[PDB]
Amino acid sequence: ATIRYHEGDISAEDAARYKGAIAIDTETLGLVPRRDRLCVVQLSSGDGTADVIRIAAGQKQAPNLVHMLADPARQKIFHYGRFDIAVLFHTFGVTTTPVFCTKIASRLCRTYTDRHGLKDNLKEMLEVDISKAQQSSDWAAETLSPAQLEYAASDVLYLHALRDKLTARLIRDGRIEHADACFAFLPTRAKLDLLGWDETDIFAHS
Amino acid sequence: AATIRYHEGDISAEDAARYKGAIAIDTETLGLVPRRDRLCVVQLSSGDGTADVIRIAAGQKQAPNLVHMLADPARQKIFHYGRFDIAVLFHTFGVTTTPVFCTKIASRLCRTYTDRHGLKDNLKEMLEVDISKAQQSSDWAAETLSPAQLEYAASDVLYLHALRDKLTARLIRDGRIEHADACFAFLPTRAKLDLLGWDETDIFAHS
Amino acid sequence: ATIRYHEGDISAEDAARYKGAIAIDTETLGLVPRRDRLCVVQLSSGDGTADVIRIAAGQKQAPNLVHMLADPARQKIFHYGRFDIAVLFHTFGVTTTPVFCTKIASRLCRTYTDRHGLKDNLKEMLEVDISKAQQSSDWAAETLSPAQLEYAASDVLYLHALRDKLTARLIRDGRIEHADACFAFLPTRAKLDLLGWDETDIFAHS
Amino acid sequence: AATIRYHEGDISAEDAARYKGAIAIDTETLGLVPRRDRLCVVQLSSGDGTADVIRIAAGQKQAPNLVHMLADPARQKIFHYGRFDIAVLFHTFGVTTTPVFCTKIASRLCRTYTDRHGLKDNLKEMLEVDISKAQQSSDWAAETLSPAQLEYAASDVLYLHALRDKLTARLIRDGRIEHADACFAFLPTRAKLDLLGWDETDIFAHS
Amino acid sequence: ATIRYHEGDISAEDAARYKGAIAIDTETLGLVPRRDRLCVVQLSSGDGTADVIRIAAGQKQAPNLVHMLADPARQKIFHYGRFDIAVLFHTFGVTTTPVFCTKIASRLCRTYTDRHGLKDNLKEMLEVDISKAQQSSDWAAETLSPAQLEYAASDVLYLHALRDKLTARLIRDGRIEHADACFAFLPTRAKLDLLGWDETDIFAHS
Amino acid sequence: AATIRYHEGDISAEDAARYKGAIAIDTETLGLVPRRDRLCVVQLSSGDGTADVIRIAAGQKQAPNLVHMLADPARQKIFHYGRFDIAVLFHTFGVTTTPVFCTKIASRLCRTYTDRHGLKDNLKEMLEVDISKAQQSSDWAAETLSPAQLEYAASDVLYLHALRDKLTARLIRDGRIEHADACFAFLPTRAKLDLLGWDETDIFAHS
Amino acid sequence: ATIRYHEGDISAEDAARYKGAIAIDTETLGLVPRRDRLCVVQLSSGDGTADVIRIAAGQKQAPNLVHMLADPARQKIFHYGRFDIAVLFHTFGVTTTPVFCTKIASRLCRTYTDRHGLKDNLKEMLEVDISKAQQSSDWAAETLSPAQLEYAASDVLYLHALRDKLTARLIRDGRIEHADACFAFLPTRAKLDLLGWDETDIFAHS
Amino acid sequence: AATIRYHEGDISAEDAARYKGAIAIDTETLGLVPRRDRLCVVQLSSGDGTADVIRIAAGQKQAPNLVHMLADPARQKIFHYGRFDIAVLFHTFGVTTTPVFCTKIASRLCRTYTDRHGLKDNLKEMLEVDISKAQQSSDWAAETLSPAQLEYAASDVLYLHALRDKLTARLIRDGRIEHADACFAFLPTRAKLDLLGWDETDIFAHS
Ligand SMILES: [Mn+2]
Ligand SMILES: [Mn+2]
Ligand SMILES: [Mn+2]
Ligand SMILES: [Mn+2]
Ligand SMILES: [Mn+2]
Ligand SMILES: [Mn+2]
Ligand SMILES: [Mn+2]
Ligand SMILES: [Mn+2]
Ligand SMILES: [Mn+2]
Ligand SMILES: [Mn+2]
Ligand SMILES: [Mn+2]
Ligand SMILES: [Mn+2]
Ligand SMILES: [Mn+2]
Ligand SMILES: [Mn+2]
Ligand SMILES: [Mn+2]
Ligand SMILES: [Mn+2]
């Protein structure tokens, strides 16, 4: 199938499709990790297909997903990893590593625009169109709608391609090393957020 | 206080060799925009109560012995708020200072009960030391640095070893030494992003 | 009829339809109770029908309405009760109790959105559409238009259903007790507003 | 001043029994974010001019005698701004402190002629008492609390009975004691909503 | 004709149509009277017809217009008189008196809205539609377009009717005396503006 | 200073008759929201160095002799910032005070070289008089007004005649006495619009 | 052709078309000259045709373009020259002089509007329509799209005409001398920007 | 200090002739809006330690000898923040003062290490001179200027030659004298744009 569903954790069979980079996004009940639980983890290996894993209330374990997230041999790709890395660390205790963030890379090379959302990035870098629902969706439902399923999958289907396009810009425009040091600090940035520094830049004076 | 060793242009090879471990360091400039306000002074201590104060001439783009200590991965460099000085040294010399310990990032990560993370209050509370802020900001590119100027420059580095050590023990006690080290590792990139114009935005925010 | 009209007070016959929760909203000349008089009280028992009571200038009495509002055996349901409780206390002297507020409950469980208006709530929680006039309507007119009448009734027709939907979220997501303590403090919050603390949170430092 | 009874971990069963009515109480932490800054001290007075100062060790999640007084519905708990400390005690111990009287909510509800609702100015005007704010914020997780620290902690609670009583008579005189009681009843929920992340928004506003 | 044109001043014949209230608005080169000159004065007697008077550069005199503006026997009606009274005083030296301001009256009785522009007022109070150009029009042109002419006339054609509608609200809602004291202070408010207090309320502390 | 005549509820008929011209006047309340903070004191001077200080009891809604002076169109009333006190007297007594002279509107209209338009600085510059702001805001609804309270209340009105006269001569000199009179005429409406809720907006702005 | 392409520098043949004013705009990788390189210089002599010069990475020389920009006998026309003068000085070391800025002139005479963009100016002053892309375009591409080419040319095709229209306003409304002193200070304003005063007005107190 | 030459209306022809080079100059008004607050005093020094203080009467629109020095292209005029005074002199007399040197634009262009660009701090650091700001802003349109007023007016110009010269040497040293001269050339237009209403916007911004 185009989208592969899992309850609680990705199957070993489908975890084995990921031999390189893993594209990933989550869905939650909101933007405060300590208040709003993790509901969905969506993955893609780059081949046009997704794994959508439904996370249950109170579930603190996903052994196969956690293994992938922890695996230093496979890069995990987010658009704004700062948040999802924090969600995964709060829920599972796992420090996702290493990571590539297409929003940080966008801010570092697409210096001519202020539009750094994923939709704007995919339209310019790949000519792909994606749509935003309406902001208001209960991702903790019993049964996710099929709309809910394709929204989640479209968040990870293109991150491989987008990473490649942006990587060539960073190298062309000379800031690939800046992006990589940003990627290495990112899990720390996410843990400071969980600790309450989420609205301050630690590198400022205040 | 005191005992200041004064140098013109660069630290002599002899005094550089006094530095067998961490290097305390601050600079003085003509202001806060590196591409506009030139580096005037770099000041250095090895943590024994002495300081090397190197005066930097306008247009000078070379400092062999200082640049070697800055680029030397074996000796840590200690600033209070290194984000600024690392950018100034890269813009002036092409040198990327590394590895660093920043006592202001440390202060923020463990001195969570306070908003005063300047050097003066850090020293007073962590070491029971007084330093004096200059009554008015001064011309650091003056033809002759005053005695008061050399003493103010020196005081910027005389206690950084001892402050690093007390803040490290706090970061260990309160469980954030790893968060701090990750900060120090990113800090040179942070300073390079300043010079390129991202200086008033946090690259990790949405905007 | 679908909408039942009253002058000054609800009839005893129509007040008797309310054997459980009373859904309620008001219409006024504006948002300052001491300046802008109460004009309309709209009620619904949950059955698709409304009572719309036209309040006259200077009227400080509505014995049957006031009895319903004061009755601790019947919950009164508002979307943002904070304001209407203050209007009713200023006009009639009545402390409406006990109350359920679908906006407080929305802010407490719909943690994934910032859209907490009634229209947004009804569309997501019940799939119902309602429309906003244009903000500018003289609710003190001689004769209310029939448009004016259905706008007022649509503000109370769904509050029962909406309360039920949101209540199951609060329990699912674990904040029903938080919502109930909010409901108990609400009439105090409204009286502090009438006293001039309306733009400060009393629980802050300032 | 004085007479401070010092305890490690929990108040002894004997001193808990001195408390047959209302309990004055404040805490000290490593800062203002409870999930980050641990509880270090809880301080208690029964209103007789003595205080119990209980030092809380890192990671400690249990305090039998203190948690019994906090959860005990028969003895009121008095804080100046209890919204914060109630959240800290719930996060540290799982205990919901109740019932409470908050002298800062009281100050705001009846001291309508002023903007200064801190403890220091409340005490000066209501009781003609001076307390001293620390010259600089301190490390409350220190290995040994100083004498000055124990005296500052104690002063936080020594006058709360007398201040509660004077503010109560003002709330009665000016007709808002009921508004105040309703506040106190909501205050534990208010503190729990803080811990869940609503801490910078008023749940009763539109946004 | 529907619109009557004049160069420099209104003719005596057309000034004689005004036996009661005079509705009036101006057009200028912008919103700083000392920088942006007066270009057009538009008038209406209430009968569906307008006089549009083109003011020339540097012209400091319009004897018949000034007589009307100065005449305490005839009320002058503006929507936001504060500005135009200042323009007329700067250009001609004339203190327009007495005045009725449909924007002040709108803010005083239409307490249920924040839309106090003339367009919003005419649509609700009279059901009339008017349109806004695009904000950018050179009112000092050689020859005003016919569009320019009807825009200017539509600013004064309805002020009589609008004044009547709003006056009945003020009396109904009990603030006619508040409105009249506002009208008496208005020319002073405009002269303080010309003196440099234009962005402070003189009745505040600062 | 001094000589204060104290009254309970209303000024006696005898002392009212001392007032054959302008009336200086200020009030004291429990705060700045009239519908919440009750009038506690009204203070009056005829400009001879004496003052009448009338204490107002909670709930009192009548003051025959004072309300006659307030409503009396033959004697001008002088406040420093009358916008507030006119609203308080209308809310408490139903009386519209008129006609008024406001020394703060006057100060703003002619003392154009400064931003300090409080009474204290007006008096110091216009009359070379010192008054003292209370060290802390006080409970003006106290059972017994202190001596210090009566002296602070009195000083609010002892110099208003002399300040009115010096500011009038400045308004005449600099050509804005007419602007000032128009202000004074609108000021009661301005205060009534405050009570109705327009208190944080200027009715003459667009919004 | 309507648009004439050049690599690196304008040809001598096409530089010779410019016997009077030179209309000019640039395209870059963004708005920080020290970070975002110069990519395109677009020119027009006023005749409906443009020269579009593609600037290569790291190129610090364009001898013929620089000669034109430096030439005090030919006025260079920008819409907001402040930025492009800084880009040209950073890239080439050239102080463009003398200059006429249609945005400064717009702010000085079109005192009745706040719309001082080029699109708004061309629509009112000349009745010409131009369109904005979408803000997000990589001007450093290998091969500029033909869309990219006409966007760049439309930025300079009308500046001659627009300069003439605005110049007659400045003279009519009496501020031509104010505009000319602004034009003389403009290259200094741009160099202060490159030095870090770009977000302060040097003539203020702070 | 001192030696002040007082003039009514205009400087006498004799004292004007003392001025054979640059002219230091400041004014005093009734406030910051020229169309509202009239010019009261113009003060002048030739840099020898003396000053001419010319009192300007209300409505006066002519000053032959002063207007000649202001309009005279051979003698530079020195203000600290000339943007304001140039606008006041143009509004009062129709004269465009030129050419000018502005020590505040100079201070901002070379004193890049500080935010304090007032005259007082400029003088203290560049010349080691103290001047005193008036304890309170004064009525400069008084019938008789006090001795203190004439001394404060004079001090505004007594050191402007010496401060111009020290700031010029800094602008030369740090490479911005040309930037400064371009500023001075635009400054009269800048002041004329103030009078026309652009006074709170930078004409070189987008908005
Ligand atoms: Mn995400
Ligand atoms: Mn998504
Ligand atoms: Mn430093
Ligand atoms: Mn220093
Ligand atoms: Mn409602
Ligand atoms: Mn409604
Ligand atoms: Mn506390
Ligand atoms: Mn404490
Ligand atoms: Mn108008
Ligand atoms: Mn119009
Ligand atoms: Mn007062
Ligand atoms: Mn007082
Ligand atoms: Mn451009
Ligand atoms: Mn373009
Ligand atoms: Mn000056
Ligand atoms: Mn002065």
CSV table of C-alpha atoms in Angstrom, one decimal, chain C residues 28-31 35-36 135-138 140-142, chain E residues 108-115 124 169 172-173 175:
chain,number,residue,atom,x,y,z
C,28,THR,CA,-26.6,43.8,24.7
C,29,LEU,CA,-25.7,47.3,23.3
C,30,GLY,CA,-22.0,46.5,23.7
C,31,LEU,CA,-19.3,45.1,26.0
C,35,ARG,CA,-22.8,51.5,29.8
C,36,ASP,CA,-24.5,49.0,27.4
C,135,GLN,CA,-20.7,42.7,14.3
C,136,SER,CA,-22.9,45.8,13.9
C,137,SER,CA,-26.5,45.2,15.0
C,138,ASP,CA,-28.7,47.4,17.3
C,140,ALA,CA,-32.2,47.4,21.4
C,141,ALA,CA,-34.5,48.0,18.4
C,142,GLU,CA,-38.3,48.3,18.7
E,108,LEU,CA,-21.0,57.7,21.5
E,109,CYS,CA,-24.1,55.6,20.6
E,110,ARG,CA,-23.0,52.7,18.4
E,111,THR,CA,-21.4,51.1,21.4
E,112,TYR,CA,-21.7,47.6,19.9
E,113,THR,CA,-19.2,48.0,17.1
E,114,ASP,CA,-15.8,49.2,16.4
E,115,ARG,CA,-16.6,50.2,12.8
E,124,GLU,CA,-26.2,50.4,8.9
E,169,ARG,CA,-29.9,57.0,19.0
E,172,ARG,CA,-32.8,57.1,23.0
E,173,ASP,CA,-29.6,55.9,24.6
E,175,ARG,CA,-26.0,60.7,25.5
